[PDB]
Amino acid sequence: LDTFQGYNCYSSALGEYAKQKNIDQVENIILSQWSFFFDEEQFYKNQWYTGAADGPVDVVLNEDLRNFANIEVLEHISSESQAIDEGRKVLEKHGLQIVLMDFYYMNSFNWKSLSRFNVTREHDPAFAVLTQINENSVHIIDPYYHHEENMSMEDFIKSRNSMTKQGKISFNSYEIFSNGTKKSNIKELLYYRFNRYLQEKMFGKITQFGQVVKKQLDNKDRKWAFTGYNCLNSVVYQHQNLINLQKKFSLEMPPNLQELLDNWALIRKKLFEYYSRGSYNTEEISNLICKVASSEEQFAQEVLKVL
């Protein structure tokens, strides 16, 4: 499908809704995001430990939407008794509902496309856009993986009341609400993001990630490298989103943005090859990560000068 990518599952679903429903500011606020996080405690629990933002809900993006556009994302929790009824209300009014779903019941990405046939089923939370409720089935879009699927009403309910690695889903839905919006120019959005990036030393978290990778030289459990590969797609998307902004608004950018994207793509490739091919190149992957950290710090400083 040709769905709004965003930079993660949450921002994808928000931007897809906002695009289809013609809600102003949301898309540009998502596409202008510039962030990196690392959590060493999440690393050793093999939870989602790095990338653009923590999840499943991107609280920093919710703060940005509130601060820049006065847009609130309201969390609706429901019971099995009311969840579908409320769904039918939301569909017959707005046409779409953003739902939290157990990805275990969603076949969004084909791992066989990357020659990975041992497709481990995991109870992870993800965001879908509900488009149709029938008697014995529903239709949902996964805008992050550009996938649609039809799901039995039984499986849809299971996916929305499921215990996951990140806690129990309770028919959670997300409403994009605004009682008095505001307009932000794309330069203002980027200026704030890149100032915040440097002030919070988010480049420093790339260094920390690289240091922890270095120390996995004796770790027989390579699951961290698979988790990392998936986590870092969010950073690649942010890089591509900024290139797409540069084109659209004819912005002044430092000249090595494509080079930075290519570096992140190479890091992802080496992490996936390490996970699956059983190489002993944790030092190589560590050095690429620590190098891109320095380059991202310089890039962020240069953006503020030329923007």
Same domain, 43 and 157: yes
CA gap 190, 35 in Å, rounded? 11
* Residue 80: both structure tokens together: 């099995």
CA gap 189, 29 in Å, rounded? 7
CA gap 77, 57 in Å, rounded? 14
Residue pair 181/25 in contact (Cβ under 8 Å)? The answer is: yes
Q: Quickly list DSSP for 176-245.
A: EE-SS-----HHHHHHHHHHHHHHTTHHHHHHHHHHHHHTTTT-S--HHHHHHHHHTHHHHHHHHHHHHH
CA gap 76, 83 in Å, rounded? 10
Experimental method of this PDB entry: X-ray
Residue pair 107/149 in contact (Cβ under 8 Å)? The answer is: yes
Which residue, 133, 154, 177, sits at the end of a domain? Answer: 177
Beta bridge partners of 149: 140
Q: Which residue has the tokens 């996995």?
A: 216
Angular region, 68: left φ>0, alpha ψ -120 to 50, beta rest:
alpha
Same domain, 34 and 77: yes
Q: Quickly list DSSP for 96-126.
A: -EEEEEEGGG---S-GGGGT---------EE
Same domain, 15 and 155: yes
Same domain, 212 and 112: no
> What's the total number of domains in the chain?
2
CA gap 63, 223 in Å, rounded? 32
CA gap 151, 136 in Å, rounded? 9
- In this structure, what is the dihedral angle of CA atoms 11, 12, 15, 21, given to the nearest 10 degrees? -130
Please check whether residue 302 lies inside any domain of the structure.
yes
CA gap 27, 116 in Å, rounded? 33
* Residue 22: both structure tokens together: 């013609």
Output DSSP code: residue 24. S
Q: How many CA atoms lie within 13 A of 43 on its CB side?
A: 19
Q: Which residues contact 102 (CB under 8 A, 6 or more apart)?
A: 123, 124, 125, 126, 158, 159, 160, 162, 164, 169
Residue pair 36/206 in contact (Cβ under 8 Å)? The answer is: yes
Q: Which residues contact 68 (CB under 8 A, 6 or more apart)?
A: 25, 29, 182, 184, 188, 189, 192
Domain with 208 in it: 186-306
* Residue 259: both structure tokens together: 């080079």
